[PDB]
Design a protein around this ligand. Structure first.
Ligand SMILES: [Cl-]
Ligand SMILES: [Cl-]
Length: 129
């Protein structure tokens, strides 16, 4: 599923991400834009052999199981395929664990490089929330 911008903001808010660990909703929408262009089926292979999955491009090195990432962990206790669903619940629940791991949203390199220090509120401007 490819979400619309306000549609995803509303879904993220419904699942408790607005101001989760202090990160306003626009931070999460911005991150999803640049990680996946709002596409739940996005996948991308990393040079270390791990793969990133879903609207927030969650990595199999640490967070999900895909059966082909040697030596990895599955700390969200989910198959990576669950992160590709049109229902964002699994992605949101795993994102809450990631953002609580110590480094906040800097866990997403694209958030640090393209959202951090910008007007992230623009990503929810105009949306009915
Ligand atoms: Cl915001
Ligand atoms: Cl980047």
């Amino acid at each position: 599923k490819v979400f619309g911008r306000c549609e995803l903001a509303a879904a993220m808010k419904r699942h408790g991400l607005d101001n989760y660990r202090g990160y306003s909703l626009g931070n999460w929408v911005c991150a999803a834009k640049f990680e996946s262009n709002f596409n739940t089926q996005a996948t991308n292979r990393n040079t270390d052999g791990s793969t990133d999955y879903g609207i927030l491009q969650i990595n199999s090195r640490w967070w999900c199981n895909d059966g082909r990432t040697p030596g990895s962990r599955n700390l969200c206790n989910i198959p990576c395929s669950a992160l590709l669903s049109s229902d964002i619940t699994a992605s949101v629940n795993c994102a809450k664990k990631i953002v609580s791991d110590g480094n906040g949203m800097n866990a997403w390199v694209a958030w640090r490089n393209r959202c951090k220090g910008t007007d992230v509120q623009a990503w929810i401007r105009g949306c009915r929330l």
